[PDB]
Amino acid sequence: YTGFTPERYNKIQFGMDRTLVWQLAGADQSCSDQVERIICYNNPDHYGPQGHFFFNAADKLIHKRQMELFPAPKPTMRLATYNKTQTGMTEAQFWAAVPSDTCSALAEQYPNWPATNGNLREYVCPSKAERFAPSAYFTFTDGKLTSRSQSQLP
Amino acid sequence: YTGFTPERYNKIQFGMDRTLVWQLAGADQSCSDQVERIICYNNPDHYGPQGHFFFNAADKLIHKRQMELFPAPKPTMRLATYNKTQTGMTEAQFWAAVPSDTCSALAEQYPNWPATNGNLREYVCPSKAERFAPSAYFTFTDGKLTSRSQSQLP
After folding, report:
1. CB within 10 Å: which end of chain A, N or C, has fewer?
2. Which residues pair up as cystines (chains A, B) (predicted)?
């Protein structure tokens, strides 16, 4: 598979039919449909950059994820910064504790689309640029931090 | 102004407060708050690549536009291609007539946020890879083609 780009990711919008997402992403040339999700690849390295898309029962888009398509520009995440986050904090509080440039916009979900309540907004904040590097993960539910975790961060 | 990027544009989400959009976009180093909208610039050219952001009465984001942040990857639009389109087309019908690779996702807007209907989704489809090339412009309203035009397509 090949050809799934940032530009195609930015064309894909919530509420789009599975068939429309598939076509805009590059269809058979770019994507694999695994029922639970579609995975669309930048290039033939399946460990490389990719987008994942998930749908509700009406086959409308409710969840976008991306890995390495929009990388954190300056990955420098450390415990000192992780320690400044807490359950319940707002997005504004979070971005005052953690620099935006150390985090990638991992996922955006509207499970109840076309309703926008219960929005899930996820970030991965890597310690360095290397694939599989220790990173912190954060999830916001309607703008409040509901999960924070890290594995082996320095 | 300088420094606005595709990665910052992809971090910015509907419903975000003006203050948060401003922060994530790069604030005064990259952006001008023109009251009616915020404009954020990749480079010191006021007509260089840029993102535009507009807000509702609650100061929450309802409208994103971009020029040259995610260009049409393969501009090929011709007059004959334009003539294949017709008002009332669905997005699927449109993309069977016009290749996605010749169109840029110019704007996305949810005027009724947090409701998601009345969605306006705009495309510009250039004939060549030059800034402000001869182009067609299209608007979909909740997935139906409601505006189409072109000037000087070959």
Report:
1. C
2. 31-40, 103-125
